[PDB]
Design a protein around this motif. Sequence first.
Motif, short mmCIF file in Angstrom:
data_model
loop_
_atom_site.label_atom_id
_atom_site.label_comp_id
_atom_site.label_asym_id
_atom_site.label_seq_id
_atom_site.Cartn_x
_atom_site.Cartn_y
_atom_site.Cartn_z
N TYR A 46 0.85 15.28 1.78
CA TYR A 46 0.98 14.25 2.82
C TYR A 46 2.42 14.21 3.35
O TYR A 46 3.17 13.25 3.12
N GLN A 61 -9.83 -2.98 5.42
CA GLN A 61 -10.88 -3.55 4.57
C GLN A 61 -10.62 -3.15 3.12
O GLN A 61 -10.28 -2.00 2.85
N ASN A 62 -10.77 -4.11 2.21
CA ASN A 62 -10.50 -3.89 0.80
C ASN A 62 -11.72 -3.88 -0.10
O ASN A 62 -12.69 -4.59 0.14
N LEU A 63 -11.61 -3.09 -1.16
CA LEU A 63 -12.62 -3.00 -2.20
C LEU A 63 -12.23 -4.02 -3.26
O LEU A 63 -11.04 -4.31 -3.43
N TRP A 89 -9.29 7.80 -10.57
CA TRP A 89 -9.71 7.54 -9.19
C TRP A 89 -8.58 8.03 -8.30
O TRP A 89 -7.43 7.60 -8.45
N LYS A 90 -8.89 8.93 -7.38
CA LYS A 90 -7.86 9.48 -6.52
C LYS A 90 -8.35 9.72 -5.12
O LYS A 90 -9.54 9.68 -4.85
N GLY A 91 -7.39 9.94 -4.23
CA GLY A 91 -7.72 10.22 -2.84
C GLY A 91 -6.78 11.28 -2.31
O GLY A 91 -5.79 11.61 -2.97
N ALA A 92 -7.09 11.83 -1.14
CA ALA A 92 -6.22 12.84 -0.53
C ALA A 92 -6.68 13.12 0.88
O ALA A 92 -7.83 12.83 1.24
N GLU A 96 3.25 7.21 -2.33
CA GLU A 96 1.92 7.30 -1.73
C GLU A 96 1.32 8.70 -1.65
O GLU A 96 0.10 8.84 -1.57
N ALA A 97 2.17 9.72 -1.68
CA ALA A 97 1.67 11.09 -1.58
C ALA A 97 1.61 11.85 -2.89
O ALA A 97 0.82 12.77 -3.03
N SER A 140 -7.92 -6.49 -5.36
CA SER A 140 -8.33 -6.25 -3.97
C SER A 140 -7.57 -5.01 -3.53
O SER A 140 -6.36 -5.05 -3.32
N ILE A 141 -8.28 -3.90 -3.36
CA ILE A 141 -7.63 -2.64 -2.99
C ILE A 141 -8.02 -1.98 -1.68
O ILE A 141 -9.20 -1.76 -1.41
N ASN A 142 -7.03 -1.67 -0.85
CA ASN A 142 -7.30 -0.93 0.37
C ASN A 142 -7.40 0.53 -0.07
O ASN A 142 -6.45 1.10 -0.62
N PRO A 143 -8.54 1.19 0.20
CA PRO A 143 -8.71 2.60 -0.19
C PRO A 143 -7.64 3.54 0.36
O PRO A 143 -7.43 4.61 -0.18
N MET A 144 -7.03 3.17 1.47
CA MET A 144 -5.98 4.00 2.05
C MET A 144 -4.85 4.23 1.05
O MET A 144 -4.13 5.22 1.13
N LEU A 175 -5.14 5.15 -1.91
CA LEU A 175 -5.43 6.36 -2.65
C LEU A 175 -5.59 7.56 -1.72
O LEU A 175 -5.19 8.66 -2.07
N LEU A 176 -6.13 7.33 -0.52
CA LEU A 176 -6.37 8.43 0.43
C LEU A 176 -5.14 9.26 0.76
O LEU A 176 -5.25 10.44 1.06
N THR A 177 -3.96 8.65 0.70
CA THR A 177 -2.75 9.39 1.01
C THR A 177 -2.37 10.41 -0.07
O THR A 177 -1.59 11.31 0.19
N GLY A 178 -2.93 10.27 -1.27
CA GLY A 178 -2.62 11.21 -2.33
C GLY A 178 -2.34 10.63 -3.70
O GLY A 178 -1.91 11.37 -4.60
N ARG A 179 -2.53 9.33 -3.87
CA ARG A 179 -2.27 8.71 -5.18
C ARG A 179 -3.40 8.96 -6.16
O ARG A 179 -4.55 9.22 -5.76
N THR A 180 -3.06 8.88 -7.45
CA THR A 180 -4.02 9.01 -8.54
C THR A 180 -3.85 7.74 -9.34
O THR A 180 -2.73 7.38 -9.73
N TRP A 181 -4.96 7.05 -9.59
CA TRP A 181 -4.95 5.79 -10.34
C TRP A 181 -5.88 5.99 -11.54
O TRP A 181 -7.03 6.35 -11.37
#
Lengths: 374, 374
Positions: A110, A299-301, A314-317, B284-285, B302-306, B308-314
Motif C-alpha cells: 500500500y 460503515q462499521n462491523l 483477520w487481515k485485509g489487503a 496501516e500498510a 466497532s470496526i471500519n473494515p478499511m 484491515l483492507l489497507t494491509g493490517r493483520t489483526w
Amino acid sequence: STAGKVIKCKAAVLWEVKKPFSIEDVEVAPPKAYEVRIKMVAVGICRTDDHVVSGNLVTPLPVILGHEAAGIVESVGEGVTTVKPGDKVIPLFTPQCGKCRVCKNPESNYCLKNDLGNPRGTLQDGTRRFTCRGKPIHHFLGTSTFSQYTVVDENAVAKIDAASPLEKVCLIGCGFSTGYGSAVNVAKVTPGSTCAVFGLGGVGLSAVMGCKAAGAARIIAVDINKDKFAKAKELGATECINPQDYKKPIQEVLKEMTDGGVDFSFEVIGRLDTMMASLLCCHEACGTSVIVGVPPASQNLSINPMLLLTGRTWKGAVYGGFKSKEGIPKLVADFMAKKFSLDALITHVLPFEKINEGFDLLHSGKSIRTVLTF
Amino acid sequence: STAGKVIKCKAAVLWEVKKPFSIEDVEVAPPKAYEVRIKMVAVGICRTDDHVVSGNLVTPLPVILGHEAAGIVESVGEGVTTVKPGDKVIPLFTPQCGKCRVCKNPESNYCLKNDLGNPRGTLQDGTRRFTCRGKPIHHFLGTSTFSQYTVVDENAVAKIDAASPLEKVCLIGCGFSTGYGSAVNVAKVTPGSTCAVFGLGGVGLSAVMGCKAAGAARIIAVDINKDKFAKAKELGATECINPQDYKKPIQEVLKEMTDGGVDFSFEVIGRLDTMMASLLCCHEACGTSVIVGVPPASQNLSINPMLLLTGRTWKGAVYGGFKSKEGIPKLVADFMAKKFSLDALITHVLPFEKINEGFDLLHSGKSIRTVLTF
Ligand SMILES: NC(=O)c1ccc[n+]([C@@H]2O[C@H](COP(=O)([O-])OP(=O)(O)OC[C@H]3O[C@@H](n4cnc5c(N)ncnc54)[C@H](O)[C@@H]3O)[C@@H](O)[C@H]2O)c1
Ligand SMILES: NC(=O)c1ccc[n+]([C@@H]2O[C@H](COP(=O)([O-])OP(=O)(O)OC[C@H]3O[C@@H](n4cnc5c(N)ncnc54)[C@H](O)[C@@H]3O)[C@@H](O)[C@H]2O)c1
Ligand SMILES: CCCCCCCNC=O
Ligand SMILES: CCCCCCCNC=O
Ligand SMILES: [Zn+2]
Ligand SMILES: [Zn+2]
Ligand SMILES: [Zn+2]
Ligand SMILES: [Zn+2]
C-alpha cells in the motif's frame, strides 16, 4: 502528431452519483515530468468503479472512473525512464514509488503515493489533466481509464510483454491479480487446507483460482447467484453453496461442513454481513480470514474480540498483496506462458461507447467481467 | 497415606462474584484414569483469576480459581504415563490432548479439550473432583490451583526439570509464556522492527521481554501507571508513555513517534478502548496487532473494515501460541539454562492463606506478580 499537445478525445464522465455515464468530448493535457500519457486499448468493468456510481465509495466528482486496463504509451514526460512511446502497459490503481517505507517493506504494497485512503482525485502532484465543457474533471485511483487517453504517474504504470493481447491482460491490472494474490500472497493458502470464498465476480473467481493454485483440498464457493456456480467449479471450487437455500446462518453451515470451520475464508463482495459471516466461518483456533471486498463508506462491523483471542487471524489487503509495478508484468509473463487463462472470466465484450450497457450486465448478474474495447 | 483416598485440605473458594475468597476445608477425590493429583507448591496471581471475581469473565460458581502454578505429583490415575509421583509439574490452562484437529495443526494451540470458550467448570470427563460443606465445587480452566491439592487431566500437566525452583517457574505456567510467546510465536516480531506494548502487568512485561528477544529496534511501553516504567525499561522497553499525559489520542501519538505506526502492537490489558488504540497504532500498510488481554464479557468493538483492507493483520491467541504440554517444559529448560530470569516479575511473595491480600496488591497496582506459597 500528439506529443506535447493537448489531446481531444472521448471519455466516459460521471457528473453525478447514481446517474449513467455520459460519453463526452474531453481534453487531456500533455504529461508532466514523471508522467505517462497512454492510449487505452481495453478496460474491464470492476465493481470498484460501480461503488462510486452507487455512492458506496467516496471520491471527488465530476470524475473519469476506470482502473482495470491495458493500453499503449502515446508520450512520456521529462524524466520518465521505465516506459517509452509504443510500449504496451497496464496502469496500476496502487502505485509502487519504490522509495517509501511501504515499498521498501517486502511484505507490504500500500504505497504512500496512493489516492485510495482520502482521495483527492488528482495525479500525484495534486493536479488534474482532464477538462470537459470548460470544467476540470477528477482522476480516479490515479488511473482514469474510461477514456481514450489518460495520463498516469510513472510509478503507477507497468511495462508488459509487447506481444500481450491487451483485451485479455487488462484483467491482470486489477481483478485477477487481486483475487489470485489474496489467496497466494495474503492468506498464503496451504496445501491440503480448506477454503471458503464469498463472492463469485471476477475478483472472487480469481481467488478460487488462487486457492487451487496453492493446493487447497477444498474450495467452497459461496454466492446468492447460482448462475456463477458452473464457472466456480470450472476454476477449482469443490462445492458451491447458496446461502438462500438455508434456514441457518451461512457461517454455521460452513463450520458444520468443515470440522468446525475453514482454514482460510475470503470475503470478495463488499458487505458487512458477509464480512462477518466470512470471519465467523473460519476455525476459531487456526482459521485466517481475508477481507477483499470494499465495504460501504464509513460503515462499521460490530466485533467481539473473543473471536480473535482463540487463535484467529483477520487481515485485509489491496491488489492481492502484489507490489504493483514489479508484480503485474510477472503475472503477464505467466499468462503468456499459459500458466493460467483468463477466458472464463471474460463473459462479455463491448465497444467503449456501450459502457452503460456493460454496467447493466454487472448489475443483472449475467456478467463476470465485461471488457470494453476502444 | 493419601493415594487412592479422598484428601481433606485447604482451598480458596469463591462462592459469589465481587466477594473475597473463603479459605476453607475442601475434599479432593482421587484421580480417575488419565488424571493427576498434585500437591501445590507455588501459584501466581494472574489478572485472569481476578476477572472471575469482578464478573468480567463468567465461569460456573462456586469455584476454585487459580491456574498459574507449579507443584509435585502426589498420585496418578490408571493409564497415566507422562508423570509419576514425586515429579515437579506445571498445570496447563489450555490442554494439549495431541489428538484433535488443533493439536495436529502445527500453527495452533487452542486444544478442543479446553474449558475456556463456554466453561463447564469440570475436568474433561465432565465431572468435578471437589466438594465443600456437602456440596460440589467447580474447577476453573481445568486447573483450580488455589488449593493445597488439585486434580488435573494428564494432557494439561507438564513434567518439568526436577531441579526447578517452583516459586519462580510457576510464572511459566501462564503469564510469562503468554506474554513472551505473544511476541515470538503469534506476532512473530522481526529483528529491527518497531513495537508497542499496551499494559505492563506480568503478561505485558513478558511481551516486552519477547519483543527484545526477537530483536525489535524499538519497544514502546504504554501504561497509565508510570510506576511500571522502571521495570519495563529494565526488561527492554526503549520508550515509556502514559496516555494520561496527552491531549491527543494515544494511537495518534504512537503513529507520530513511529513514521506512521508500529510494525507490531500488543494489547495486554483487556479493555475495548486499548484494543482499539492498539489496532489503530500499527502501520496501516504493514502493521500487525495482537490481542492478548481478555475483554469484558459480551462487549464488542466497532470496526471500519478499511482498517484491515489497507494491509493490517489483526489476531489473537491464548498462551502466547505455545502448544502447552510440549512448550512449557522447554521454557523451563531455557530458564534453568539461564537464558532469561523471572525475578523482575515477582514483586511480592505471600503464604497461600493471604490470597486476599495478594488480590488487594493486584488491585492497587503495586504488584506485578504476587506468588503464593503453600
Ligand atoms: N481489495 C482490493 O484490492 C480490491 C480489488 C478489486 C475489487 N475489490 C472489491 O472486491 C469486491 C468484488 O468485486 P467484483 O468486481 O468481483 O464484484 P462483482 O459484483 O462482480 O461480484 C460480487 C459477487 O458477490 C455475490 N454477492 C453479492 N451479494 C451477495 C450476498 N449478500 N451474499 C453472497 N454473495 C453475494 C454477487 O452475486 C457476485 O457474484 C468489490 O467490493 C470490489 O470493490 C477490492
Ligand atoms: N491470552 C491469554 O492467554 C492470556 C493469558 C494470561 C492473561 N491474559 C489477560 O492478559 C491481561 C493482562 O494480565 P496481567 O495479569 O498482566 O494484568 P495486570 O492487571 O497485572 O496488568 C495490566 C496492566 O495494564 C495497565 N492498564 C490498566 N488499564 C489501562 C488503561 N486503560 N490504559 C493503559 N494501561 C492500562 C495496568 O496499569 C497494568 O499495569 C488480562 O486481561 C488477563 O486476563 C490473557
Ligand atoms: C479506493 C478505496 C479503497 C478501494 C481499494 C480497492 C479498489 N481498487 C480496485 O478495485
Ligand atoms: C479465551 C477466553 C478464556 C480466557 C483466555 C485465557 C486466559 N487464561 C489464563 O490467564
Ligand atoms: Zn478493481
Ligand atoms: Zn511507495
Ligand atoms: Zn487437542
Ligand atoms: Zn493467567
